Structures are given as C-alpha cells and as structure tokens.
Amino acid sequence: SATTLTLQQFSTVYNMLSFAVASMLGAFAFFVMGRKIVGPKYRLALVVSSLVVLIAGYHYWRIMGSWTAAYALKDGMYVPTGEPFNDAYRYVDWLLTVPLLLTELVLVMKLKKESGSVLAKLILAAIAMIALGYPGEISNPESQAGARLMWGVLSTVPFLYILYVLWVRLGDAIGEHPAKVQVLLKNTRYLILLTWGFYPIVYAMGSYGWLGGAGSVVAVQVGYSIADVTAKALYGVMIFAIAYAKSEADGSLPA
Amino acid sequence: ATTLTLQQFSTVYNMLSFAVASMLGAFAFFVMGRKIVGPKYRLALVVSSLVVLIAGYHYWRIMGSWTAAYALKDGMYVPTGEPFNDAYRYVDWLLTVPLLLTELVLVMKLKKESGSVLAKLILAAIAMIALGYPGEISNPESQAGARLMWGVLSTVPFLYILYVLWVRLGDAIGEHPAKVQVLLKNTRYLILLTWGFYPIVYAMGSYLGGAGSVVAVQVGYSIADVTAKALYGVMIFAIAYAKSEADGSLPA
Amino acid sequence: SATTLTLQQFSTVYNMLSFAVASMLGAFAFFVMGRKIVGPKYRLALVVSSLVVLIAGYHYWRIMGSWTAAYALKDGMYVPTGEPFNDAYRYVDWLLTVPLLLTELVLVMKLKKESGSVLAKLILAAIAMIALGYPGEISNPESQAGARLMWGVLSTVPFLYILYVLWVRLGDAIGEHPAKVQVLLKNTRYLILLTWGFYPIVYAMGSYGWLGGAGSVVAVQVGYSIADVTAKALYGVMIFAIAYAKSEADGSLPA
Amino acid sequence: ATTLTLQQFSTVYNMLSFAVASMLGAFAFFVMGRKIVGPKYRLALVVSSLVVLIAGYHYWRIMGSWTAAYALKDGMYVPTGEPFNDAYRYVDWLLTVPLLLTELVLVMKLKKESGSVLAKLILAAIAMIALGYPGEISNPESQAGARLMWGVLSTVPFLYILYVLWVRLGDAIGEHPAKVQVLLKNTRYLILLTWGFYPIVYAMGSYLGGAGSVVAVQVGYSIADVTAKALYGVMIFAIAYAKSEADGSLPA
Amino acid sequence: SATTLTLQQFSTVYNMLSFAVASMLGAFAFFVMGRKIVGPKYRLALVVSSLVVLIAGYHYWRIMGSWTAAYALKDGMYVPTGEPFNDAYRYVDWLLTVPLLLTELVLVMKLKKESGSVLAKLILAAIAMIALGYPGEISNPESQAGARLMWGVLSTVPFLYILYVLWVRLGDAIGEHPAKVQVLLKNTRYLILLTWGFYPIVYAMGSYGWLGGAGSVVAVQVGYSIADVTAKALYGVMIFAIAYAKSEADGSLPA
Amino acid sequence: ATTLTLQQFSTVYNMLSFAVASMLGAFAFFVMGRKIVGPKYRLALVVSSLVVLIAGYHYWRIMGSWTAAYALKDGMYVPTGEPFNDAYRYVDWLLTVPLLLTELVLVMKLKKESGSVLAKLILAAIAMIALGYPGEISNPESQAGARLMWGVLSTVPFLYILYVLWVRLGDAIGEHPAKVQVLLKNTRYLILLTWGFYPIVYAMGSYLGGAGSVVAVQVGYSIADVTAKALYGVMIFAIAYAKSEADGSLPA
C-alpha cells in the first residue's frame, strides 16, 4: 500500500493544494480583467495565459479531491483508503498546458514570419516530451527499471530542444528591445529554467528515491504546487508585464 | 461484465479528464476570442462556445458514469452493477455535430444556396447518428450482424457529408487571400482525419481484445471528440481572425 | 403497475430526454445572443423564441428527474418504483409554450392592424385546445372511453382552427414577400404541419394502443423529444432566419 | 391530515410546476425587455423582474414542501407528518404585493403626489396581508369565527387599494394617446379580476369538500399569483412599450 | 432548555426570516440597478446602501439555518434540539451594518468640510454602542443582573448621542433644501426614531420579561425581521429617493 | 484536545461569521467602486476584489472547520476528533499578502524601480509566511524552541517589509495634493498597527491560558485579517478616489 500520515502532513499537502487552486483561479480573473490594459495586438497572449491557469485550476481541484479521498481519519491519523493518488494525473494537465505555455510567450513576442514555424516545432516538441514521459512514469521504478530509464531519456531529448530554442531564440530577440523589455524577457528565461527542472528531478527521484517515508510524499507534492504556481501563474504575470511594456513601447497602450 | 486493471481504469479516466479540461479551455477561448475578431464572424464563435460547453458538461457526466461503473477490489477494478452509458456520446453528437457544421457555414461567405446546403448536411448528420445508434448498443458478440449493417447504413450519409465539405471548401479557396486559403486547405484535411477516426473506433469496438477493446473505444472516442470540436473550433477562430484582418474589421 | 425495462431501453429514453434538455437550453443561448444580429423591429420575436425553449428546458429537466425516479436498478434491470411517470406533465408545458409559439410567428411577420386580433384568436384557440385535451388525457382509455373521445373531439376543433388560420393567413402573406422569405415561411408551415400532428396521434394511440410493451413506451417518449426539439428549437431557428431575412429586406440589418 | 387521490396530488403539483415555469419565463422576458423600451421605463421592468424572480423561487420551495407532505401508499398519497406551509405565500405577498404597486406607479407619469400615494398603498397592502395571516392559519372548522373576522378586517385596506387604483388610472387615460388609453383601461379590469380572485379562494378555504377544498385553494392561489404577477408584468411592459413609441424613446 | 413550539409558531418565525432574506437581497439588486438613475455624486451612497442589505441578507440566511437547526419535528411538534439560537448573532450583523447605515445618510447629504468629522464621531459612537451592549447581552438576566444593567446603561450613552446628532445635524440641514427633500429627510428621521428603539426594548425585555412562553419568542423574532427590513431596506429606499430628489434639484439627473 | 464553554465556541464562531460578512461586503464595494474612480486606478481595485474574495471563501471554510471540530455535550462543546486546520490561514496569507502589496504599488505612481521593489516585497512576504508556517504548527508546550526560532526567523523579512513601506510612502507624500498626503500618512499607520498585530497573536499562542488562548488566537487572527484586507482596501479605494479627483479623471 502506501504510507500513513499525521494530521500535520495531510493538512500541509491539502493546504498547498488549496493554495494552488486559489492561485490559478485568481490569476485567471486577473488575466481576464487585464486584457483592457494592454495593446490590442498582445491581448491574444493574455487569453492563452488565462487558459493555462484555468485548466490547471480545474486539474488541481480534482487533485485536491483525489488527495482527500486517498486517506481517511482514524485515531487522529490519516491512513490510506486504497483509492490511488498518482502523479500520472498531472501529465494530463501538462500535456495540454505546456504547449500553451510556449504559445503565450511566442504570441507576446514579435512575429517574424517564421514565428509560426518556431511555435509549431516547440508545440510538437513539448507534446512528444510529455508523451514519451508517460510510459516511463507508469512503469514500476523497480520491476520495470529498463523501461523507465529509456522513456525518460527519450523524453529528455525534446526537453533540451525546447530549452535550447528558448535560449537561442530569446537572446537574439532580447537584444533588439528596450531595457525594461530585456529585463522582463531575461527573468522569464530564468523563471522557466529554475522551475521546469523540478519535473524531471521528481521523475528521477521516483527512480532513485522518493516514496521513502511520508515527508518525501509531502515535499514532492508541496514542490509540485510551488512549481505549478510559478510556472503558470507567476509566468503569466510576466507575460502580462511584457505585454504592458511592449504596448507602452510601440505606443498602443489604451489612453 | 469484465474486470479492468488499475492501469486501464486510470487511462480511460485520464482521457475523460483530458477531454473535460480541453472543452473548458476551449469554451473560455471562444467566449473571449469573440471580442478579438470582426463583428460578422462572432456568431460563428458563439456556436463554437456552445459546442464545447455542451460537450464539456457531457464529458463531465461521462466521467461520473465511468467512475461509478467500477469499484476497487483486490488491486483490481471490478464492475459495480451500475451501468456505463456509452450511448450518451451519440445523443451529444446528435446535437453537437449539426452545430459543428453550422459554425463552418457561418464563418464562410454567405451565398444564396448556403441555406439549402446546411439543412442537407444536418439531415445527413442526423441520419448518420440515428443509424449509428442501433449499431453502437448492439452486442459485438451475440449481435454482430446488426452492428455491421447499421455501421454500413450510417456511412452513406457520412461519405455524403465528407464529399460536400471537400467540394464546397475547395471552391472557396481560390477567391480569398493566401492566408485564408491555407487555413481552408488544412481545415479540409483536419475534417477528414478526425471524422474518419470515428468509423475506425466503431470497427474497433466490433472486433476480441476484451478490456483493451473497452479502453481503446473510450480513448479513441475521447480523442476524436476533443480534436473534432475544440481543435476544430480553433480553426474556425483562425479563419475568423484571418478574414477579419483581410476585410479590415479586426477590432485592433 | 407498469412495464419492466432493460438498461438499453431506460438509457435510450434517458438520453433522448438529455438530448432535449441540451437542445432547448442551447437554443436559448443562441436566441439570446442572436438578438444583436437582426433588425430592432424583429427582436421581440426572438425574445419569445428564447422563452419557449427556456420553459421547455425547465420542463424537460423535471421530466428527466421524473423518468429516473420511476424506475430502479435491480439485477441488471430497471423495474418500476411506483412513482408515476405521466404525459400529463407535458400539458403544463404545452399550455404555456404553444400560445407562445404562435406569438413569435405573428411578431416576426408584418403587423396589419388586425395582427392583434389574429393573434388573440389563435392564443385563445390554443389554450382551449390544451384545456379541453386535459380531461381526456387523464381519463382511463378503457374504463372512461366516452369521456376520452369527447374531450379529444372538442380539443380537435380549435386545433384545426389554428391550422386553418395558419394556412390561410400565411399564404396570403407569403405571396407578398421576397423569394427567400417565401421559402422560409413555406417551410415553417410544413414544419408546423409535420410535427404538431404527433401529439394527437399519441393521444389517439393511448385510446387504441400504446402502453402495450416497453418498446412502445420508449418510442413515444423518444417521439416527444424529437417533436419538441423540432417544434420549439428548430422552429425558433426558422423564426430567427425569417427575422434575419426580413431585416435584410427592409434594410434594418445592423451594419 | 387527509389522504389525496393520485389525481389530486398530481393536479396541485402541476399547477405549482406551471407557476414555477411561468415565473421563470416572465423573469427572462422582463430582463430582456428592459433593453427594448425607453430608458425612463426600465426601472419599472427592473422591479417586474424582481417580483417574478422572488415568486419563482418561492413557488419552487412551495413545490418542494408539497411533494414532502405526502407519500405514495396503496395507490394513494397519504400525509407524511412533514407539514405543508401554506402561510409561505403570505410572506411572499408581503414583499411582492408592495413591489407590484411600485412598478405600476413607476411606469406612469411621475407627479408631486406620486410619493404619498405609493406609501399609502403599501401601508394598506401590508395591513391587508398582515390581517389576512391570522385568518389564513386559522382552522376552518374549530376556529371559524377568527377566520371570518380576519377576512373581514383584511378587506378594508383591500377595497381601499382597489378604489385608489380605479380612480388614479381613469384620471390618466384622458391625457395619453389612444393605444396608451386602451392599455390602462384593460389594466384596471385585470387588477380587479385578479385581485378579486384572492378573496374568493379565502372564502373557498373557509367553507366542507375535504381534499377537493385543499386542491381548489392551492390551484386558485397559484393561478391568482401567476396572473397577478407575470401577466400583470406583461401589461407593465406593454404600457412601457406604448409610451416609448409615443415619446420617441423606443430604442429602435 | 427552551420552549416547545407548534408548527404554526415555528412556521411563522421561519416565514418572517424568509421574508427578511428576500427583502434584503431584493433591495440589494434594486440599489445596484438604481445607481444608473441618480446623479454621479450620490452613487457612492447607494453602494453603501447595497452593502448594508447584502450583509444583512447573509446574516439572516445564517439565522434562518440557525432557527431550523434549533428545533426538530416530533409528533407534529417542534421540540428543541439543544443547538442554540441566540440574539448575539445579531450583534455581529449590527456591529458592521449600523456604522454603514449612518455612512450612507451622510454621503447622500451635502458635505460641509466637517462631514468627515461628523461621520467619524457617529461611526465611533455606533461601534461603542454595540461593543458595550455585547457584554450585557450575553450576561444572564437573572444570575448576572448587575452586569446586564451596567453595560446597557453604558451602551445607551453613545446611542442617545447618535440620536441627538441626527436630530440637530439634520434639522439644521433640512431647512436648507427644497420641500420634497425636506419631507424625505424628515420622514427618514421618523423612520430611524420609530425603528431603532426596538433593539433596546428587547434588550430591556430580556432583563424584565421575554422568554416567558413561545408567543414571546415568536413576537420578538418577528419584530427583529420587521425592524431590520424597515431600518435597512426601507431606509435604503429613502436614501435612494433622497438621491434622486437631490440629483433632480442640482440638475445632475442623467438625461 | 480541550473542551470549550458555550460562550467560547460562540465567540470564535461569531468572529468568523463577522469576517465572512466583512469580506462579502468589501468584495461588492471594490467591484462597484471600480466604476467610480479613474480608469488608471481600477486594476488596483480589481486586485482588491480578489483579495477579499479569496479570503471570504477561505473564512467560509474556516467556519466550517470550526463547527466540525466541536460537538455540544452536557452544556459544553467537546472535540469531535475532526481536526481544526489553523494552518489554513497561512496558505491564504501566502497568496493574499503578495496581492495586498501589489494593490498598494498599483494605486501609487508607477516609476522605473516599481518593478524591482514589488518583487522584493513579495519574496520577503513569501519567506515570512514560509518561515512562520513551521512555527505555527509547532506545539506550544512540547515544541517551544522551534516556535520561537521560526517566529524569530520570520520577523526578519517582516521588519524588512515594514521599513520599505514606511520609506516609500513618506517619499511620495510630499509630491501630491493635501488630501492625497493625509491618506498616505494614515495608510502607513494602518499598515503598522495591523501588520504588528500578527506577531502579538503568534506570541499569544506561544504563551498557558488553555481555551482562552484558543479563543484569543482565532479572534485575533480574524480581526487582523479583516482590518488588514477589507479596511486596507477601503484606503486603497480612498487613495484612488482622491487621485481621481486630483487628476480630473473622476468619472463624474
């Protein structure tokens, strides 16, 4: 089965899940309302921003239900119920939202005829990343260690491709914009860099650790919440700030 | 009925949760994207919003029916006696497929014959779904003859719909700007790929596999619905955005 | 009591009821949104169109609850619960919506001073039709065959009156409009003609058939759904198309 | 209490479902009809929307109370011990009747005395409902004296309200266009027919019949509420539309 | 414990609570919609009017739940359940809404530089009134009669202060406005005078009466509903009427 | 755990119901007050609406948790075994405190450094709440050392936030009209009074009292949240209204 949890551990994970739910839905309303403030050519990017956090809001709402249904209160403790709580529900979120995360960045940036081509490759790359990752995630890290490693390696190839394209296609376009736009674009890269590495690490953790003890279960689940809120809601605020800065630069800010 | 492995139940549940999320995301897009395109293409986005709203609620219900048809016992998911209503999609299609045809006609240029053309497609789609329904609920083992016959009878209006869409979309490519032309070409390919997937899943259910067959049919129908409705609506929006940039009606 | 049903039969009726619910509510949103597109003198007719489908949406929502509450799952079967499922709940729908169906047609057509008089007679006719039909519907087709026939006959008199008025007041006004308006008005008559005959036939069926077997129960209930969706939602789309055509003819289409 | 036949329970339930549907339909009409009339008559339609919205929810509750007060046993509907709160309409009237008077005053031309006139009618309507409430909950058999007395005391502000409405509506007929005049004449007749129906139903409940009496009172009150609120609001809208076409403020 | 109630007594209190709920929420929608009709300098007062009735709507919704949960149906009777129904939940309503009631009156009236000072004193007075009243309300009228009286007396001091300020600050400003504004301002004072005295009387009743019998329980609870609807919803209508009259006087009525 | 008197349970429940009502009232104010101030200050009111909306729902949940953690027995409220999640506020603060800082920055004049300043405050607020959380769930009796340490570590970013707000608000007083200046002065005092209250309640929970301690912490946190969010948002609105009257953008 799984691990027994204290009220403190169960509450901590439940609260970080409720933190995630509130952050995604609140950011949704913010991005919906923020459309009126930026230039008209950057409003489609904010719509996609709202879409990302809306979907992750729905998915975290289900995860929160899944978490409370996998444990039951007995003798001042939370003991498993047999109902499964898995990380593979997250992939259903990622498969849709990660291609959308790339889309909103490209839409807020300048289109250079090939912008469609650059986006299409990244979307296809992100899809294959999650798609190849899924067989490895549902594989038993012990009884199926060969399959887990193979899919992880195959999944990492389009992953580094996305990271490479973002580094090379952003710096060549960072150095063409005002100082405020550069800082916003620069930090957005760091934001992607710091946060997106969490998911493969936890995948590699299950292969070489994690599940060992309740604290590991809490930490990983707390980590997913922090990573998702920053990679989706905070990331969407950066897209909004880039839209306002670029709208302020080309003179399209509503007056 | 049959017992499922933990993986099979999880997989079908996830594809159902994927479908719910895709519709919810597509709904918000079409509602908000209405403001971004020209004023004469917004009714097409209104119909797009309804299609995904209806299918979203219906997939929300399908997910409830799925989780209620199995129970976890001994590391397995065994049936509960509560039935899984697989015919619930066909009543959705009976409403949403006629609506999908409408949004394509509305996003295109209105002609004199547009009224007659739409009604014929809807009558075909109705007869298609109507003939398919006896075949869908037929037992693939004890009632294999009826499944094929209704499958065969249903494809006649099916191929009729595909022919009309191919011919009425190619005739409009050569009158529009290049960007509008590319979108219409890809839209034809998209309709063919997605609408052709459903006959395969019907033939998948017919032929035995066991639980893998159950997973495939539910996964296949779910993917088909998501691509034929939400991905399809994005093309309707993209056609609306291109035509709005061409006729100078883009709100920007 | 009543009949026992298979899962297939119960599901079929349940699905056609859910089809009806979705069609009525979806058409409501369509007609509400479609007001902006037609001329201002035809928008009141679309409001009445929305009202018809909204009411039928509410009534079919209750019918769906009534259907699931009249049967219970036992041994892979649906056996009655004793709770009644009757066609007389439909008359409460018809008594309000049928007068409204006539109203929206007259409002989309040209007012000719007497338009109030024509409408008032039809509304009074439709009311008496449903009102006279109700005593006959709740009468036992066997133990009370005299009362059933008498009310059916009395109900058919204002029915044919409505049909006569529609045929004579529409053709005299069809031949005064453009070709597209004529086709729309012509098909609307056929739509009324084909669909409205279903209700008396089922009334006459209960007198001389139906209730015999489960298949009859399914067919009649499936028929009501098909008839209601076409006589209310498809009919409202025809009213919308007439409004757009007439708005396009008199030059009032919003530009 | 008393047992009801299947027909009696069904009839009262249907008239309650008729009332719910009528209010829901009337609500959407007044909300949407606000946009169609002139800008100075829209607050009257706002109040119209509230009246039917409040009464719709209340009739939704009355229906729940009705179905919860009886149970199906032996081809009969026998009481459950759960009570049916027939006084729930009077607390509705205490709110909605003062609102109904307001929407009539708002749709008419505002004068200096309009403020005083409205307050007097509301005070009368309050006292009318207030005196009627002791009489409504009084037992028609063991407490027949109190029922009549409260009925008698309640009609004094009742006839006061009817007199004022007759006199303030006839004085405004002769200053308006012909179409506005006809509407005001019919509005007076409508108020008299509908407001007079309630005293009959109170006298119906007093005098015994048994279950037929129970059906009549509930059917009568339901019909009276539907005609005095939703049908009444359509006249308020019709007066608004006529005055908007007369003063040139029709949004068209 | 408490008293046993008949179905009639329980229904009466339940209905007057549902009357209060409907009146507060309905007035909320009225004040929200009524903003468009008055001058722009009086619209903030109507927002505060909506706030008062919205809060009292929420609080009466809870009181209605509290009432149904304090009694249970047994043998055609309503007997207590042990769950408490107290008047001290009302103070949580009053502590917020009474300062708001004064605010909306001052905002609809003319600001005379010191209007902030006058309002601040009244708000501080109203707060201390409810604050001093609370220790006395939760005191046992019999075992704690010294504390009940003392807090009641201390609570009455800012109460009469508010009444004095309203009488003196309104008449000096009534006699500066048109006749219609004077009548509206004059009746608003009478409205405050008649209704606001109910609360101390019921406080003094618990000290020297009430709780004796079920009829007293019904009357007091019925009284609170009548008092709250007139002191909040009817009072807000008077504020709306003053705003429309003053907007009509200074020529700011939307045309 | 500990049993509570009827008064203690009622008091904490009332302060929770007070908090719910205050947030609901504040939400409607900020939504409606958006229309009343100038167009460039409305995003700050949008964020104000979210803060109170989030905290309103969370206090609605806290009230449910509170009533579910005790049961009435023998004229007492005794624990039920169902736990009261007191850490649920800290996850609220983790979202709402960063939002509260934002609305202040948005209502003020935007400068070049405004971007950097906000991010530092949010990082501080995050670390503040993050370090406070281990201390909040620590047992005041068996784990008194950890409570103090996390309390001590949490105040470092706390005093950092207070210093920045004092210095960036005094620098903006002397560039604005007198009415704007007074509001900014009082806003500083308000932030200090309310933000300083939380450390006291943490020290209250640490030091024993018993149930009175439980009441104080819950009452203190509730009052602190209501004044630091709803009362704070009214000042944000008042600053918005004053600046709108100064720059001539008041919708009137």
Ligand SMILES: CCCCCCCC/C=C/CCCCCCCC(=O)OC[C@H](O)CO
């Ligand atoms: C709905 C329940 C029944 C289900 C069965 C399928 C119903 C299909 C209905 C299609 C409505 C299409 C009406 C189109 C009327 C013309 C509108 C139009 O041409 O507008 C173009 C543009 O918006 C001008 O600017």
Ligand SMILES: CCCCCCCC/C=C/CCCCCCCC(=O)OC[C@H](O)CO
């Ligand atoms: C077993 C019984 C089976 C019964 C099966 C019945 C099916 C009826 C559906 C017909 C399709 C009608 C589509 C209607 C679309 C009309 C659109 C229209 O008329 O608008 C054109 C005009 O140009 C705008 O101005």
Ligand SMILES: CCCCCCCC/C=C/CCCCCCCC(=O)OC[C@H](O)CO
């Ligand atoms: C509501 C809870 C208590 C129930 C007790 C009954 C309350 C009756 C209230 C009536 C409000 C009427 C206020 C009318 C104020 C004048 C508005 C007006 O004259 O506006 C006309 C027109 O809209 C300008 O263009």
Ligand SMILES: CCCCCCCC/C=C/CCCCCCCC(=O)OC[C@H](O)CO
């Ligand atoms: C047992 C205790 C029973 C107590 C019973 C108390 C009843 C109080 C209701 C009075 C009616 C008040 C109606 C208020 C309508 C005012 C409308 C108004 O003042 O507006 C006019 C002005 O012209 C706009 O500008």
Ligand SMILES: CCCCCCCC/C=C/CCCCCCCC(=O)OC[C@H](O)CO
């Ligand atoms: C939200 C979930 C994560 C929680 C972590 C805290 C997030 C803090 C986000 C702040 C958004 C601020 C974006 C501001 C972008 C600039 C907008 C602006 O300057 O607009 C001014 C004015 O409206 C022009 O007229």
Ligand SMILES: CCCCCCCC/C=C/CCCCCCCC(=O)OC[C@H](O)CO
């Ligand atoms: C245990 C792990 C702990 C991890 C902790 C991670 C915390 C990340 C939060 C950083 C604050 C970011 C605030 C972002 C505010 C940005 C606002 C902005 O960029 O807008 C300025 C520009 O002027 C508009 O045009």
Ligand SMILES: CCCCCCCC/C=C/CCCCCCCC(=O)OC[C@H](O)CO
């Ligand atoms: C894990 C948490 C990590 C910390 C997350 C919150 C801090 C984010 C601060 C962003 C300031 C961005 C502008 C910084 C300007 C000074 C620093 C700098 O050197 O920026 C060079 C750039 O060219 C401009 O001048």
Ligand SMILES: CCCCCCCC/C=C\CCCCCCCC(=O)OC[C@H](O)CO
């Ligand atoms: C500033 C831009 C973003 C900056 C980069 C953000 C990246 C976030 C990713 C992973 C953090 C995971 C942290 C996991 C910390 C868990 C803390 C915890 O509570 O674990 C203790 C456990 O509960 C004992 O039982």
Ligand SMILES: CCCCCCCC/C=C\CCCCCCCC(=O)OC[C@H](O)CO
């Ligand atoms: C404009 C709207 C027009 C809508 C037009 C809809 C036409 C019929 C569609 C679906 C019927 C679905 C039920 C089909 C049943 C097939 C018979 C069958 O064998 O299955 C069920 C039966 O009860 C054995 O148990």
Ligand SMILES: CCCCCCCC/C=C\CCCCCCCC(=O)OC[C@H](O)CO
């Ligand atoms: C185009 C304009 C409208 C055209 C005219 C539309 C009129 C619809 C009225 C009645 C149809 C009733 C059809 C009933 C078919 C029932 C099919 C069925 O499924 O019954 C099999 C049963 O389930 C085995 O057990």
Ligand SMILES: CCCCCCCC/C=C\CCCCCCCC(=O)OC[C@H](O)CO
């Ligand atoms: C502006 C708002 C003003 C509103 C003004 C409302 C005035 C009173 C109305 C209804 C009271 C209903 C209860 C009446 C009770 C009558 C006494 C009675 O005998 O019945 C109940 C009693 O508990 C025996 O059980």
Ligand SMILES: CCCCCCCC/C=C\CCCCCCCC(=O)OC[C@H](O)CO
């Ligand atoms: C016009 C401006 C406002 C005018 C002033 C309004 C002040 C309302 C305050 C208190 C009234 C309390 C009245 C309580 C009446 C209770 C009637 C009742 O029903 O009690 C009988 C009991 O139920 C038998 O068992």
Ligand SMILES: CCCCCCCC/C=C\CCCCCCCC(=O)OC[C@H](O)CO
């Ligand atoms: C932009 C968004 C950035 C958000 C950044 C959030 C950073 C961490 C915040 C809260 C963690 C709350 C849990 C802290 C747990 C402390 C460890 C502990 O001892 O308690 C739990 C443990 O499971 C013993 O049972």
Ligand SMILES: *C/C=C(C)/C=C/C=C(C)/C=C/C1=C(C)CCCC1(C)C
């Ligand atoms: C909002 C959610 C986001 C940004 C999720 C991102 C997920 C990844 C970048 C996952 C990467 C993986 C690999 C590189 C290999 C192992 C499998 C994955 C899917 C965890």
Ligand SMILES: *C/C=C(C)/C=C/C=C(C)/C=C/C1=C(C)CCCC1(C)C
């Ligand atoms: C949104 C749903 C859509 C677009 C559904 C489309 C469905 C089809 C094209 C179905 C076709 C079928 C046949 C050709 C025969 C077998 C039965 C069907 C209904 C699966």
Ligand SMILES: *C/C=C(C)/C=C/C=C(C)/C=C/C1=C(C)CCCC1(C)C
């Ligand atoms: C939306 C619902 C509609 C259009 C319903 C129409 C119903 C009828 C035309 C019913 C007619 C009847 C008779 C002519 C006699 C027998 C009784 C009736 C009510 C079934």
